[PDB]
Amino acid sequence: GLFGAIAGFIENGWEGLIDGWYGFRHQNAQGEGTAADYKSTQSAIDQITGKLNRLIEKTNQQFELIDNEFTEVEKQIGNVINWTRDSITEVWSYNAELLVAMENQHTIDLADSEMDKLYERVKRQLRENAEEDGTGCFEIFHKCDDDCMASIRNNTYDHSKYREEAMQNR
Amino acid sequence: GLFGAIAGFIENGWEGLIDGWYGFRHQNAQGEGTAADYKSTQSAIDQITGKLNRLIEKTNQQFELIDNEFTEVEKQIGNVINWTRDSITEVWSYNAELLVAMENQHTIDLADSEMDKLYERVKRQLRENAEEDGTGCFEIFHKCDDDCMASIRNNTYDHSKYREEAMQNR
Amino acid sequence: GLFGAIAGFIENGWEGLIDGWYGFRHQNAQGEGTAADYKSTQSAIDQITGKLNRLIEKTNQQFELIDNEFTEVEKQIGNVINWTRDSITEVWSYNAELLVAMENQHTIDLADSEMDKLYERVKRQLRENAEEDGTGCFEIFHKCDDDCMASIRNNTYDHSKYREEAMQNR
Amino acid sequence: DKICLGHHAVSNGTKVNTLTERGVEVVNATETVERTNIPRICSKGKRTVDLGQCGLLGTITGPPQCDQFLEFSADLIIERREGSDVCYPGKFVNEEALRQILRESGGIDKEAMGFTYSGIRTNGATSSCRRSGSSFYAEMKWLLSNTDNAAFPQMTKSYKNTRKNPALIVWGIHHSGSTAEQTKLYGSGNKLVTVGSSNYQQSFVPSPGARTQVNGQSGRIDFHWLMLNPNDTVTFSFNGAFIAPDRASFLRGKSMGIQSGVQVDADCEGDCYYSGGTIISNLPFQNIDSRAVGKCPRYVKQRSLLLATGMKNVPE
Amino acid sequence: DKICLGHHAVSNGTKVNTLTERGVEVVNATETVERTNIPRICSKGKRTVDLGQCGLLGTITGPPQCDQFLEFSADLIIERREGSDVCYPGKFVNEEALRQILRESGGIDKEAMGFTYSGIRTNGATSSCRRSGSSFYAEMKWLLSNTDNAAFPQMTKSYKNTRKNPALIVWGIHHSGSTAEQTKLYGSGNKLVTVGSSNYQQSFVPSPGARTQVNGQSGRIDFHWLMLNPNDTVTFSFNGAFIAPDRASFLRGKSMGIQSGVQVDADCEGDCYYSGGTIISNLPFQNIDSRAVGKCPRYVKQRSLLLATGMKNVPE
Amino acid sequence: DKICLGHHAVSNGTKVNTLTERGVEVVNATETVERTNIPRICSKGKRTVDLGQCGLLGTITGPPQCDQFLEFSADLIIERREGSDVCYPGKFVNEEALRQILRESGGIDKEAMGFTYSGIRTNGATSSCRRSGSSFYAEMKWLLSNTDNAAFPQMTKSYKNTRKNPALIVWGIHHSGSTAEQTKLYGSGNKLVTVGSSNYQQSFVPSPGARTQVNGQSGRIDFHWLMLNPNDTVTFSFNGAFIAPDRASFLRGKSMGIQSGVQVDADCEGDCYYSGGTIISNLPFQNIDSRAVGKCPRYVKQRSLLLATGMKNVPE
Ligand SMILES: *[C@@H]1O[C@H](CO)[C@@H](O)[C@H](O)[C@H]1NC(C)=O
Ligand SMILES: *[C@@H]1O[C@H](CO)[C@@H](O)[C@H](O)[C@H]1NC(C)=O
Ligand SMILES: *[C@@H]1O[C@H](CO)[C@@H](O)[C@H](O)[C@H]1NC(C)=O
């Protein structure tokens, strides 16, 4: 939680959000709706994908036998070979464990960031017509019919339309 | 300072804060108090601990002699051995230096993050009853008795109680 | 875009900003001006510099011949040598590609952070005298003559001077 | 009144490790270390050779077993635990260097060395190299004295590699079971075999005497081999105990040798092989065989290293 | 009026490096590269062997020094700079291979090879292998002709490994200080020693002649060794210059060998050893000995690499 | 009314790779993998030696080619494809070990070994080692019998290293083109050469016989070499076929050897050399020669790895 959204100021995830990774859940006069956000969901996805594309990789370098499983090579040479190979195992095993931990840290942090980024986008959309409840909700100081909610999701909410009324609920 | 709080908009640390890593310092009618925040302090600590737990590690791989300190092995073989070992020294020396620098970068940034996260938590708590002084203070537009400050630290500050008065100090 | 500013809520860069990396572009009564911000620009630069300093590095370890280009060494030994060297080539090639990708990720994110940090600095400066347009602009609810703009850039904008008026444009 | 934003979760996510914390539950993860075998050498697409009873070095000298393989072609060569390079008891000097050379050679193209012999037996044979009863290494002439105890003529033979690649030249030194049998086969008095080119230069004395009864023989054959450069020439000086090459070997193209204990299968396609199968995987790591060969995922100690592919998982 | 939040600081923090900046001051840091020795081989918990004067290879042949160690048991074996494998001057063929084999063997269990000899001296001795004045390698019979210049009988001896593990077999070839002393010990005319199993097959001629006066001798003993498989058999053919095995050696369990210059200590417990001590540490890196052995921290060039364990430090 | 903040951009930025995305356009980047050669051994600052026709091992034995180089001094030594260690046909036992020893030696300081000979020829020569017509390895005396077929006296020679460093000692074994020419040069009957110190101990028999006609000779010289410790002593026992050292070699200081195919240049300064030039670069990686030597950038498979040095680039 480098960004403090996921597993942070948002209390927990929505096991119902089967539509995408991020989303809005509104409550108005008409009832209550949950919708997923394509842009943020898709970005988080694009990025994790990119990680995969990079990590699912084949090096075009062939390695051949220097050992012999059937008739064991000379002891000193085979011992040097065993030592080199074991040392190399140590390096890659480390490289793998580190790579995976670092990548998981960054993946999680990245998702947290995408959440924050979305929240802050909506916050910016509202401007002065809503206040932050601190749990990842915006209390809207005007009346938000289902078309309004929709407008907030498709980023077409004009704060000017509702400024007077909302402000007036000072 | 990926987050700009520590060594950022907060001017500097408090050599007096012997209680924890993060904390509130209030000034009200009754005087002036400093207290530490358990949750944020404890999170930063938990994480650095986890780093340590991972980095203080023993590999269960034995390595034996292929060399000889007393009667030097054959030159060509011992030269190949010296070359392999020196190359492997190069790799681990790099791996160590990089690991440490990357881990220090992330540690610092993570602390910065925990500071921001706390600040923003209080901001969220206060809602509309306070304004941001930009130095990492909140000027409260109402009267904050020691019980009030306490409530802000134990997260029990109800902004509703003071909204009228604070707002009214427009 | 870990921070969502660069290639984020700011729509795009300014091909005209030849002064520095970050900057303010204001529009007032008297016209329209663009200026660069020394502090943020210089910080992003200081850091990428630090990366370079670390990455442009020479190891003071000499490596000598164990091979022979003219008269090829014994097959088994030279095959072991070829295998060790090729394995080490695999490790460094990986270390290099990873180092570069990780460093580019962090560099980008760091710049994004510096942008955010600057924005938020100005936001903090304004306090209550301006509102966030969401494109990385501050609409100022008072009159900002060129000296005022200047004051905002050299960090000498006193919000007290303009609070009454700006607020009053509620 | 209100609009809230959130993120998904699942009831049962999977745990992964991070820089900072062990076993954090995230939504989805994927495996990074391959553990999945295919108990069959995936030969499809490449020309394969299974040697079975044949030993690899044997494909040059040509004892009974390797009669199938005296001129083989390959892309993939397969050694088997039961393989043997030998019929009449003996080791190859520098055996493994040669084995490695052969495993990458794409097969061998054999060719006569034009050796003619005067006033001696060319047809030495034994009850170990069985075919028509007693015989010998189909590429080696067992040079013997004209009749028992007849002093073996001091001879010299010679061969020029007249091709663009180099030539593999094998010869053998018969160490007799007793001083009696040596002088029975080659005549009394000292014996030497000298071998020289421009690269090579070495020489051999036979060592008669009794060793353990491997294959019903007590004496042994020391096999020696050299590489012969284009335009170069080999010379043999000898007066006994010399098992002569009849043909020389040339390397065709390129290949890869593996030591397998499992079936072939030209249905599936592969590129990483290990003694007990094939490893087909996209994963950048494997935990199967340290020693596996071909184009391979890096070998690591770790059974599993799960790579998160989803956000922190925080259920209700 | 106001509530402020902050973080701690200390007047004197410590500097660490980051991806981006060198020597940034953070609150607390911890060391990551171990530099801390213990000038003593931490032997506690494991059965130790200090050889001192004894040389490791010696424990097979058994010169004076190694009489303590002819049947030793170990978990940890310790070579000392003064150790010696030899009393009568001579090298071991493939010495270091063998040394490595012994350092991991858990000790040796010796056993008679049942060699009986007819009509020759079995009791050859020398003023170098001191005990009761002159003696020999307590595991080797110095076979000599029945009296001076007496032609040494052509002999053959044999031994079957009848155990589940393999058997270490050492023998020696005496190279006499002069042709005179050779024919004085074994009689005139050529001499050969042949050695064969199924694995092995090799042979030896003595090389009489004068070399530098090591230990007051001019001639040398070449020690040769082979490993003998379960069910297998060794055969020796010879007529002189042959230093015969009396017993064969078997490997007990498992162990680790170190080359130390420092005292033992069964008070402290350890797992990483280097020539000048023991390394007990949790740290994942060390800067002590490139060559250190056991279960060890990775060796690095760097004296110190400080790992920050606290936030950026910004004092007043 | 308004103040806006932003960042710069450029129309044409450059693409780099990140953990998350391939080929993202950022403002400025810099190259990280060096590809830039200098077709010339940058010798300035360091004392150089180009051997050309001389072979490195030759600088000890001293055939015609290496007469320039019998006592050379260097910091950087340079082998050339045409170099040769030999005039009269023959190999060096353990050649490459020695080559490596010499490439780091800072040069050689030669010194007489005080060998005197009685009642034999000291001045053997041949039509291969051309100078004044026929000659020999300017550091080796070709010891010959006093006249044809004259039995070669059994001799012994000896040398003590009386310096603080060790001493390089080379000697040779002449394998004659025929048994006839051997007994023509050294007399009939067996021949042995034994060589011993405290470190070393080995011996040689000549192997007469005909090999391929390299340099117009059919027999060969086996060169052998040993290292001789301070205070130590070498002894040679022999009765023919022995090519004697006249002088011994000592190692001056320190140097580095390279195998180059390109010109020297004492104008430019360097520290990383590869067969086809010099690599001067700050870059931490190179794609030029796997095998390059000196103080070098790590070798990597990748042609280019661009490291972003500027922000994400977003033009209008
Ligand atoms: C190398 O390790 C393998 C483990 O599979 C072992 O079988 C072999 O004996 C080792 N080689 C030697 C001789 O040290
Ligand atoms: C190997 O390097 C060590 C130093 O670590 C040195 O003491 C030794 O002489 C070298 N030996 C060989 C043959 O590499
Ligand atoms: C090692 O590789 C080089 C080129 O990469 C090749 O020329 C050489 O033949 C190889 N060595 C052996 C003996 O395989």
Residue E290 CA: nearest ligand 2 atom is: 5
* Cβ contacts of B106 within 8 Å, gap of 6 or more: A105, D19
> A124 touching C, CB under 8 A?
yes
Domain that holds residue B65: 1-170
> D100 touching C, CB under 8 A?
yes
> B61 touching D, CB under 8 A?
yes
Range D47-262 has CATH code 3.90.209.20:
yes
* Cβ contacts of D193 within 8 Å, gap of 6 or more: D171, D173, D203, D204, D205, D206, D236, D237, D238, D241, D242
Per domain, the residue ranges of chain E are 1-46+263-316, 47-262
* Alpha-carbon gap: D4 to the closest alpha carbon of chain A (Å): 4
C-chain CB neighbours of E301 within 8 Å are: 61
CB F152 within 8 A of CB F176: no
3-state DSSP assignment of residue B92: helix
Residue E258 region, left (φ>0) first, then alpha (ψ -120 to 50), else beta?
A: beta
D74 CB-contact burial (10 Å; exposed 0-12 / middle 13-18 / buried 19+):
buried
Measured CA to CA, the distance from residue D103 to residue D72 in angstroms comes to 12
CB E261 within 8 A of CB E275: yes
Q: State the Rg of chain E over Cα.
A: 29
Tell me the C-alpha to C-alpha distance, in Å, between residue D239 and each of D123, D144, D145, D182, F37. 16, 10, 9, 12, 57
Instruction: Annotate F213-268 with DSSP letters as a single string.
Output: -GGG-SSEEEEEEEEE-TT-EEEEEESSSEEEESEEEEE-S--EEEE--S-EESSS
Cα-to-centroid distance, C94 and ligand 3 (Å): 22
Instruction: Report the residue of chain F nearest D228, measured CA to CA.
Output: F212
* Cβ contacts of E263 within 8 Å, gap of 6 or more: E39, E40, E41
Residue C82 CA: nearest ligand 3 atom is: 1
Instruction: Annotate D108-173 with DSSP letters as a single string.
Output: EEEEE------SSEEEE-EEEEEESEEE--TTEEEEE-SSTTPPPPPEEEEEE--SSS-EEEEEEE
Cβ neighbours around F74 below 10 Å, total: 23
**C-alpha dihedral, E15 to E19 to E22 to E27, nearest 10°:** -20
> A89 touching D, CB under 8 A?
yes
What value, to the nearest 5°, has the Cα angle with vertex C44 and ends C39 and C48? Answer: 145
Phi, psi of D145 (to 5 degrees): -70, 160
To one decimal, the resolution in angstroms is 3.1
Tell me the C-alpha to C-alpha distance, in Å, between residue F237 and each of C84, E247, F241. 42, 35, 11
What value, to the nearest 5°, has the Cα angle with vertex C111 and ends C105 and C116? Answer: 125
CB E246 within 8 A of CB E140: yes
Tell me the C-alpha to C-alpha distance, in Å, between residue F183 and each of D232, F149, F178. 29, 6, 9
Cβ neighbours around E231 below 10 Å, total: 11
Nearest to D178 by CA among D145, D214, D220, D124: D220
Number of domains observed in the structure of chain C: 1
Measured CA to CA, the distance from residue D291 to residue D279 in angstroms comes to 12
CB C159 within 8 A of CB C128: yes
Give all strands of the β-sheet with B22-27 in edge-to-edge order: B32-36, B22-27, E2-7, B137-140, B130-132
Measured CA to CA, the distance from residue A164 to residue F26 in angstroms comes to 43
Nearest to F208 by CA among F185, F179, F229: F179
Spell out the long-range contacts of D111-115 with Cβ–Cβ below 8 A and sequence spacing 24 or more. D111/D247, D111/D248, D111/D249, D111/D250, D112/D246, D112/D247, D113/D159, D113/D245, D113/D246, D113/D247, D113/D248, D114/D159, D115/D141, D115/D157, D115/D159, D115/D244, D115/D245, D115/D246
Q: Which of B47, B56, B60, B98 to mutate to test the interface with D (most CBs of D within 10 A)?
A: B47
Relative to beta strand E29-30, strand E307-308 is antiparallel
Measured CA to CA, the distance from residue F282 to residue C57 in angstroms comes to 7
CB D311 within 8 A of CB A45: no
CB D26 within 8 A of CB D308: yes
Q: What is the b/e burial string over A134-144, where b = at least 16 CB atoms within 10 angstroms of the residue's CB?
A: bebbbebbbeb
Location of structure tokens 């029945």: E146
3-state DSSP assignment of residue F58: helix
Nearest to E140 by CA among E124, E127, E119, E155: E124
Relative to beta strand E201-204, strand E48-50 is unpaired
CB E309 within 8 A of CB B3: no
Measured CA to CA, the distance from residue D32 to residue D34 in angstroms comes to 6
Nearest to B153 by CA among B59, B23, B14: B23
Measured CA to CA, the distance from residue D138 to residue D201 in angstroms comes to 26
Instruction: Report the residue of chain C nearest D102, measured CA to CA.
Output: C75
Nearest to C159 by CA among B134, F17, B154: B134
Measured CA to CA, the distance from residue C13 to residue F13 in angstroms comes to 12
* Alpha-carbon gap: D252 to the closest alpha carbon of chain F (Å): 26
What value, to the nearest 5°, has the Cα angle with vertex A149 and ends A145 and A150? Answer: 110
What value, to the nearest 5°, has the Cα angle with vertex C48 and ends C47 and C52? Answer: 115
Measured CA to CA, the distance from residue D145 to residue D120 in angstroms comes to 5
Measured CA to CA, the distance from residue C143 to residue C156 in angstroms comes to 16
Please report, as a single letter, which amino acid is at residue F132. S
**C-alpha dihedral, B132 to B138 to B144 to B145, nearest 10°:** 180
Tell me the C-alpha to C-alpha distance, in Å, between residue B83 and each of A80, B61, C66, D294. 12, 22, 8, 25
Nearest CA to ligand 1 atom 10: A82
CB E143 within 8 A of CB E282: no
Cα-to-centroid distance, A82 and ligand 1 (Å): 7
> A107 touching F, CB under 8 A?
no
Nearest to A66 by CA among B83, D291, C91: D291
Nearest to D239 by CA among D165, D292, D185, D278: D185
Measured CA to CA, the distance from residue F32 to residue F305 in angstroms comes to 6
CB B14 within 8 A of CB B24: no
Q: What is the b/e burial string over E62-96, where b = at least 16 CB atoms within 10 angstroms of the residue's CB?
A: bbbbbeebbebebbbbbbbeebbbbbbbbbbebbb
Please report, as a single letter, which amino acid is at residue E24. V
Fold match flag (D1-46+263-316 vs D47-262): no
Element (H, E) at B80: helix B75-126
Nearest to E98 by CA among A75, D200, B10: A75
Size of interface E-F (CB pairs under 8 A): 37
Element (H, E) at B50: helix B38-55
Residue B75 CA: nearest ligand 2 atom is: 13
Measured CA to CA, the distance from residue D274 to residue F169 in angstroms comes to 48
DSSP state of B127: G
**Which residues on neighbouring strands pair with residue F285, listed in sequence order?**
F33, F298
Measured CA to CA, the distance from residue A37 to residue A17 in angstroms comes to 10
Measured CA to CA, the distance from residue E282 to residue C109 in angstroms comes to 34
Three-state SS sequence of C100-151: HHHHHHHHHHHHHHHHHHHHHHHHHHHHHHEEECCCCEEEECCCCCHHHHHH
3-state helix, strand, coil in chain C (%, to 5): 55, 10, 30
**Which residues on neighbouring strands pair with residue D224, listed in sequence order?**
D171
Measured CA to CA, the distance from residue B88 to residue C88 in angstroms comes to 8
Does the distance separating the beta carbons of A103 and F20 come in below 8 Å?
no
Task: Count how many residues are written for chain F.
Answer: 316
E2 CB-contact burial (10 Å; exposed 0-12 / middle 13-18 / buried 19+):
middle
Cβ neighbours around E22 below 10 Å, total: 12
Nearest to C134 by CA among E204, A129, A136, A60: A129
Chain breaks in chain C (C to N over 2.5 A) after: none
Tell me the C-alpha to C-alpha distance, in Å, between residue D20 and each of A102, C22, C170, D313, E14. 9, 33, 47, 16, 22
CB E214 within 8 A of CB F198: yes
Measured CA to CA, the distance from residue F282 to residue C76 in angstroms comes to 36
CB E315 within 8 A of CB B13: yes
| Chain F residues 59-118 with CB within 8 Å of chain D | 89-91
Q: Which two tokens stand for residue D18?
A: 């991070």
Element (H, E) at B147: helix B146-153
Please report, as a single letter, which amino acid is at residue C93. S
B-chain CB neighbours of E298 within 8 Å are: 92, 95-96
**Which residues on neighbouring strands pair with residue B158, listed in sequence order?**
none
User: Which ligand lies nearest the alpha carbon of B83?
Assistant: 2
Nearest to E170 by CA among E104, E262, E108: E108
* Alpha-carbon gap: B18 to the closest alpha carbon of chain A (Å): 25
Measured CA to CA, the distance from residue A93 to residue A86 in angstroms comes to 10
Three-state SS sequence of E140-185: EEECECCCCCCCCCCEEEEEECCCCCCEEEEEEEEECCCHHHHHHH
Nearest to F27 by CA among F46, F43, F47, F11: F11
Measured CA to CA, the distance from residue F151 to residue F125 in angstroms comes to 19
3-state DSSP assignment of residue F95: helix
Q: Which two tokens stand for residue A21?
A: 């990774």
Nearest to D26 by CA among D11, D13, D8: D13
Location of structure tokens 């799960």: D306
CB C141 within 8 A of CB C28: no
3-state DSSP assignment of residue E221: strand
Instruction: Report the residue of chain B nearest C59, measured CA to CA.
Output: B90
Relative to beta strand F193-196, strand F201-204 is antiparallel
* Crossing angle of helices C75-126 and A75-126, rounded to 10°: 20
Measured CA to CA, the distance from residue E279 to residue E268 in angstroms comes to 11
Ligand 1 binding pocket, CB closer than 6 Å: A 72, 75, 78-79, 82
Q: What is the b/e burial string over F218-248, where b = at least 16 CB atoms within 10 angstroms of the residue's CB?
A: bbbbbbbbbbbeeebbbbbbbbbbbbbbbbb
D-chain CB neighbours of C76 within 8 Å are: 94, 96-97, 100
Ligand 2 binding pocket, CB closer than 6 Å: B 75, 78-79, 82; E 290
CATH class for domain D1-46+263-316? mainly beta
D-chain CB neighbours of F205 within 8 Å are: 205
Measured CA to CA, the distance from residue F108 to residue F168 in angstroms comes to 10
Residue D239 region, left (φ>0) first, then alpha (ψ -120 to 50), else beta?
A: alpha
Measured CA to CA, the distance from residue E160 to residue F184 in angstroms comes to 49
Cβ neighbours around E37 below 10 Å, total: 16
Three-state SS sequence of chain A: CCCCHHHHHCCCCECCCCCCCEEEEEECCCCEEEEECHHHHHHHHHHHHHHHHHHCCCCCCEECCCCCCCCCCCHHHHHHHHHHHHHHHHHHHHHHHHHHHHHHHHHHHHHHHHHHHHHHHHHHHHHHHEEECCCCEEEECCCCCHHHHHHHHCCCCCHHHHHHHHHHCC
Measured CA to CA, the distance from residue B105 to residue B103 in angstroms comes to 5
Nearest to D138 by CA among D50, D58, D208: D58
> A54 touching F, CB under 8 A?
yes
What value, to the nearest 5°, has the Cα angle with vertex E301 and ends E297 and E307? Answer: 65
* Cβ contacts of D54 within 8 Å, gap of 6 or more: D65, D66, D68, D69, D83, D84
3-state DSSP assignment of residue E36: coil
* Cβ contacts of D163 within 8 Å, gap of 6 or more: D230, D250
Measured CA to CA, the distance from residue F312 to residue D126 in angstroms comes to 80
CB E309 within 8 A of CB E17: no
CB F91 within 8 A of CB F222: yes
DSSP state of D242: E
Measured CA to CA, the distance from residue E52 to residue E263 in angstroms comes to 11
Q: Which CATH number does the domain housing residue B167 bear?
A: 3.90.20.10
Does the distance separating the beta carbons of A59 and D295 come in below 8 Å?
yes
Instruction: Report the residue of chain D nearest B107, measured CA to CA.
Output: D20
Measured CA to CA, the distance from residue D161 to residue E295 in angstroms comes to 53
